[PDB]
Amino acid sequence: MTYRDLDNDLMKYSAIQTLDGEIDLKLLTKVLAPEHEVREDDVGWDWDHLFTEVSSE
Amino acid sequence: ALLLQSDQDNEAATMMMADLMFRKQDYEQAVFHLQQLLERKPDNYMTLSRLIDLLRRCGKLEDVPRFFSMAEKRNSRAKLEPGFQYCKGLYLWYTGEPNDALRHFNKARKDRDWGQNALYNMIEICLNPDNETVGGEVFENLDGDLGNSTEKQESVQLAVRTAEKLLKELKPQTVQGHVQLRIMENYCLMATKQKSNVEQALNTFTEIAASEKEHIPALLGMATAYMILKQTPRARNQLKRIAKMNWNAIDAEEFEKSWLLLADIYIQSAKYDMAEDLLKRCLRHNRSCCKAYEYMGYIMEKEQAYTDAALNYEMAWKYSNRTNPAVGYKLAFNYLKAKRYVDSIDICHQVLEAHPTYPKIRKDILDKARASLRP
Amino acid sequence: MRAVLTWRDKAEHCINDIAFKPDGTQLILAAGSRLLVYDTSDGTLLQPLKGHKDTVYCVAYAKDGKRFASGSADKSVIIWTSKLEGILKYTHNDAIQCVSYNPITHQLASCSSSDFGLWSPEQKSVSKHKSSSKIICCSWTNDGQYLALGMFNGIISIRNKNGEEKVKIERPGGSLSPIWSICWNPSSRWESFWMNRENEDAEDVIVNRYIQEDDNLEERNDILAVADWGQKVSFYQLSGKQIGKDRALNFDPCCISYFTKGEYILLGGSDKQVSLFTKDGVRLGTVGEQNSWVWTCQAKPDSNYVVVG
């Protein structure tokens, strides 16, 4: 791996961390849950299943 | 002791006391006091990274994973933290995985403490990913089947020319930071092997050495630039100059590198006794050093001590994580010559496991060891 | 599947081959430069037998339980009575490798680097017959009529009881895959042959002497286990035809071996264990795993015990 290939770990998240190239917000960003756990679906819940799922985690 | 009596949880006093125990060679106490501090404070990347280097210098890296697990048990998010990522990046550089070390350092690299220290170790790998004596004639005359290829040359020189970008990410806050930055930018200029860049590097190193006559990272710069310039007699004295000095924990890596480069030059001179002294002095400050053992195993094979050569090659095989098939060959070959044909065949399997299609070994070692096995 | 260590010992030297008395009462071991005699019940070592000069590379023991053969790096072969005296010495062309008595006639074979030396009991001569290659391992057909030889050259070849060569198979790759042991399956009518004895006395001699100097094979039922250092095991008929497919491994195998029953296989090697298999070469389990390479795994007569070297 090159330096550029490693830098992909930081490249996308920088747009949330940083404002106008002048400010860095990283201390606040510690509160964020990651996008793939924050995303939601147009899918239904039923109490027996929803309880079973929340109990299985 | 007074500070620890006034507050037992003062981390700086525990670590300073552990460093003094280490200087007094009470390494077991130095370890145990940092282990106690981690059992009070499992999430403590300073105490952890100090303990990791104590365990590297002792040669006891196998003890480390406990303390990562303790941080993960206390704090499930510890894996996300730049100090964990720095501590993990250090570990993989010592186990033998430079790519995984780079991956974990990269995840830390922007942090004001852990990222600054990660960046220096990314620069070490990006300068020298095989951890060689830069310009060492015992081994830079070898590896030619890869070292003559554009594939190894261009990818390594891109890593050198981008270590300058990692150095542009090392914003300094002190004159010592500016000097160490300028030295490592000039190590990038050395590593290009382009004569004007190497002469500029030599000039910055000699200017820094003229301002500070004991500045070891600049003196190693002079020696390395002079070796690349083929001015090997000028390198030799500038390394002897370093070799007379007492060691310290800050210059330690440039000390350990300088002793290895001087030991190579002593092998070129055939005065192996001064090389063995430098290799053993290097191991006394850091028992982990694979290059200190690999040079010593080569001396044992030159001396026809195929058993002690196999002991050095076994450490080099183990601490390469079995990724050095040249030591793989040498270890199998030394077991063959030691009349240990089963052990030779064990290693010929481990080399073919580590690298399929690896040349020479199958016919010469493996089939001659098989052919002896019942005579 | 469960396996229990009944007893253990360690010799002074490496252990090269293993022999059992047919009633299972004594174990004999080719350790370094002497023969060692053991009780199978608890591992007491009764006697180091002294006759050889150099490395005892193997021992094997005849179906009547009166005589055993042992072969050395000093080029000798010695025939020992079960009175543990060496009544008939012999001296081959080069170092001995494997030796094997015939199930039926008590005719012996003794392999070496080029030459294999057949003789039938107390005749005055030995057929020192020639080979293309180093003759690593040897095994008689279950009816006694063919001696099959495995070669370091990766060939198995089949010789009749007179020493003529009748069939060959080459492992694809040749000397890449040395044949380090082979075994004919015990599973035919002849296994009870010599299973009825109650003789209460033995032969005795003053001092140790010297001995001087085939059709319709597809209808022959025998099956040969082949273990090669290409790291594969496969089964073969006397016709030279392969049965099914090569049962692959991840080690250099040694001493492919069977119980008296012919239904389960033992397989030792550079896996440093004794693996257990069906007669189809499917794995079933693990007998005790080991500190070092396994050269030998011999199932006890009439019973489920195993011994390892």
Give one DSSP letter per residue of chain A, joined into a string. --HHHHHHHHHTTHHHHEETTTEE-HHHHTTPPPHHHH---S----HHHHHHHHHH-
How far apart (Å, rounded) are the C-alpha atoms in residues C72 and C69? 10
Q: Which chains touch A (3 or more CB pairs under 8 A)?
A: B
How far apart (Å, rounded) are the C-alpha atoms in residues C288 and C306? 10
Whether residue A4 and residue B162 make contact (CB cut-off 8 A), yes or no, is yes
> For residue C73, which phi and psi values (nearest 5 degrees)?
-60, -25
B279-to-A31, B239, B243, B262 alpha-carbon distances in Å: 50, 14, 12, 10
How close is the nearest chain C Cα to the Cα of B127, in Å?
A: 40
Whether residue B345 and residue C270 make contact (CB cut-off 8 A), yes or no, is yes
How close is the nearest chain A Cα to the Cα of B256, in Å?
A: 26
> For residue B353, which phi and psi values (nearest 5 degrees)?
-65, -50
Q: Which chains touch C (3 or more CB pairs under 8 A)?
A: B
Residue type, B69: S
Interhelix angle B11-23/B27-40, rounded to 10 degrees, is 160
CA C200 to chain centroid, in Å, comes to 27
Give me the residue from B342, B346, B374 closest to C97, CB to CB: B374
How far apart (Å, rounded) are the C-alpha atoms in residues C259 and B301? 48
Whether residue B103 and residue A6 make contact (CB cut-off 8 A), yes or no, is yes
Question: Is C39:C27 a contact under the CB 8 Å cutoff?
Answer: yes
- CA end-to-end distance (rounded Å), chain B: 68
DSSP 3-state assignment of B326? helix
B301-to-B84, B209, B287, B309 alpha-carbon distances in Å: 41, 38, 21, 5
How close is the nearest chain B Cα to the Cα of C176, in Å?
A: 8
DSSP 3-state assignment of C155? strand
Residues B137, B143, B146, B148, CA torsion sign: positive
Integer-rounded Cα radius of gyration of chain A: 18
DSSP 3-state assignment of C79? strand
The resolution in Å comes to 3.5
CB atoms within 10 A of CB A12: 9
How far apart (Å, rounded) are the C-alpha atoms in residues B271 and C80? 61
How far apart (Å, rounded) are the C-alpha atoms in residues B274 and C272? 43
How far apart (Å, rounded) are the C-alpha atoms in residues B263 and B239? 10
Q: Which chains touch B (3 or more CB pairs under 8 A)?
A: A, C
Q: In DSSP terms, which residues pair with C110 in a beta bridge? A: C99
Pairing assessment for the beta strands C306-308 and C67-72 based on DSSP bridges: unpaired
How far apart (Å, rounded) are the C-alpha atoms in residues B221 and B242? 11
**Closest chain B residue to the Cα of A34, Cα to Cα:** B80
**Closest chain A residue to the Cα of B165, Cα to Cα:** A3
Q: In DSSP terms, which residues pair with C258 in a beta bridge? A: C265
Interhelix angle B175-191/B150-169, rounded to 10 degrees, is 170
Residue type, C66: K
**Closest chain B residue to the Cα of A14, Cα to Cα:** B110
DSSP 3-state assignment of B289? coil
Residue found under tokens 């310290």: B248
Experimental method of this PDB entry: cryo-EM
DSSP 3-state assignment of B282? helix
Residues 194-233 of chain C whose Cβ lies under 8 A from any Cβ of chain B: 229
DSSP 3-state assignment of B297? helix
Closest CA to B31 of B7, B12, B57, B1: B57
How far apart (Å, rounded) are the C-alpha atoms in residues C91 and B99? 62
Pairing assessment for the beta strands C232-237 and A18-19 based on DSSP bridges: unpaired
Interhelix angle B290-302/B325-337, rounded to 10 degrees, is 40
Residues B261, B266, B272, B274, CA torsion sign: negative
Residues B328, B329, B330, B331, CA torsion sign: positive
Residues B326, B327, B333, B334, CA torsion sign: positive
Interhelix angle B216-228/B252-268, rounded to 10 degrees, is 30
How far apart (Å, rounded) are the C-alpha atoms in residues B367 and B78? 51
Determine the residue among B75, B88, B100, B162 to mutate to test chain A binding: the one whose Cβ has the most chain A Cβ atoms within 10 Å.
B162
Residues C231, C233, C234, C236, CA torsion sign: positive
Question: Is C295:C255 a contact under the CB 8 Å cutoff?
Answer: yes
Burial class of residue C115 (count of CB atoms within 10 Å of its CB; 0-12, 13-18, 19+): middle
C111-to-B22, C62, C93, C103 alpha-carbon distances in Å: 64, 16, 10, 17
Residue found under tokens 């480069």: B261
Which contiguous run of DSSP H or E holds residue C110? strand C108-112
DSSP 3-state assignment of B144? helix
How far apart (Å, rounded) are the C-alpha atoms in residues C140 and B134? 64
Whether residue C252 and residue B349 make contact (CB cut-off 8 A), yes or no, is yes
How far apart (Å, rounded) are the C-alpha atoms in residues C46 and C27? 10
How far apart (Å, rounded) are the C-alpha atoms in residues C36 and C46? 8
B chain contacts of residue A1, beta-carbon cutoff 8 Å: 99, 102-103
C chain contacts of residue B367, beta-carbon cutoff 8 Å: 175
**Closest chain C residue to the Cα of B370, Cα to Cα:** C178
C143 CB-side CA count, 13 A: 11
Sequence length of chain B is 375
Which contiguous run of DSSP H or E holds residue B103? helix B98-108
Q: Is B329 left (phi over 0), alpha (psi -120 to 50) or beta?
A: alpha
C219's tokens: 């209808």
Residues B89, B134, B300, B248, CA torsion sign: negative
Question: Is C141:C186 a contact under the CB 8 Å cutoff?
Answer: no
Question: Is C284:C274 a contact under the CB 8 Å cutoff?
Answer: no
